[PDB]
Design a protein around this ligand. Structure first.
Ligand SMILES: O=C(Nc1cccc2cccnc12)c1ccc(N2C(=O)[C@@H]3[C@@H]4CC[C@@H](C4)[C@@H]3C2=O)cc1
Ligand SMILES: NC(=O)c1cccc(N)c1
Ligand SMILES: [Zn+2]
Length: 199
């Protein structure tokens, strides 16, 4: 209702002009949101709130919770089994983590894989406007977030930290990206079924 409209507003307002020229996610300025489904998985929520509490206690009664986008070819697995760092790619910009973004267009670059992979399954198009894509709008506990400006391949959060904020840099990092090294620090709150729209 008002809950889904703010999700739809956040999905549209956070689109950016990508330094890849739309190569990975596609050519678009806006989406066509088809459905917003609220994921209600109590076992995943219990895991999330438990870790959230531990984190708050190690960061001045502050979880540093953010509402962030996640784009991955594994969204249906995530909605059932939750985020899992055991599946995290080791050679990512910030290492073996679960990457999230404030800009839905960044998460959109990863729905079919790193640099959009091949593209959509049935047409093999990264800029496909026909096939329906899926993004997750997640509750993310960042806790004590470590600000890293360059590439740093780490396996776990830096000592005393609960995440990594990959802040924007000239040579080279276009937009912010939030990385957790523990799956229990994010809850797949909303499942956005959408299509990127041709300008
Ligand atoms: O929890 C995740 N997967 C799964 C969760 C439950 C079950 C699963 C079963 C099978 C496979 N996966 C599963 C998950 C972890 C890490 C990443 N991940 C990456 O592999 C890299 C590239 C892709 C997005 C950006 C760049 C980054 C990232 O966030 C995506 C998803
Ligand atoms: N997979 C994603 O949604 C994502 C978010 C931020 C940064 C990166 N690299 C990926
Ligand atoms: Zn397609």
């Amino acid at each position: 209702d008002k809950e889904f409209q703010s999700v739809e507003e956040e999905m549209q307002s956070t689109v950016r002009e990508h330094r890849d020229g739309g190569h990975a996610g596609g050519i678009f300025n806006r989406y066509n949101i088809l459905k917003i489904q609220k994921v209600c998985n109590k076992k995943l929520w219990e895991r999330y709130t438990h870790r959230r509490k531990e984190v708050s206690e190690e960061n001045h009664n502050h979880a540093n919770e953010r509402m962030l986008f996640h784009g991955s070819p594994f969204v249906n697995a995530i909605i059932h089994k939750g985020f899992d760092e055991r599946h995290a790619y080791i050679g990512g910009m910030f290492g073996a983590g679960i990457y999230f973004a404030e800009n839905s267009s960044k998460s959109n670059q990863y729905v079919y894989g790193i640099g959009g992979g091949t593209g959509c399954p049935v047409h093999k198009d990264r800029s496909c406007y026909i096939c329906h894509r899926q993004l997750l709008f997640c509750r993310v506990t960042l806790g004590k977030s470590f600000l890293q400006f360059s590439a740093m391949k780490m396996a776990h959060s830096p000592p005393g930290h609960h995440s990594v904020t990959g802040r924007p840099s000239v040579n080279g990092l276009a937009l912010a990206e939030y990385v957790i090294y523990r799956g229990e620090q994010a809850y797949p709150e909303y499942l956005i079924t959408y299509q990127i729209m041709r300008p």
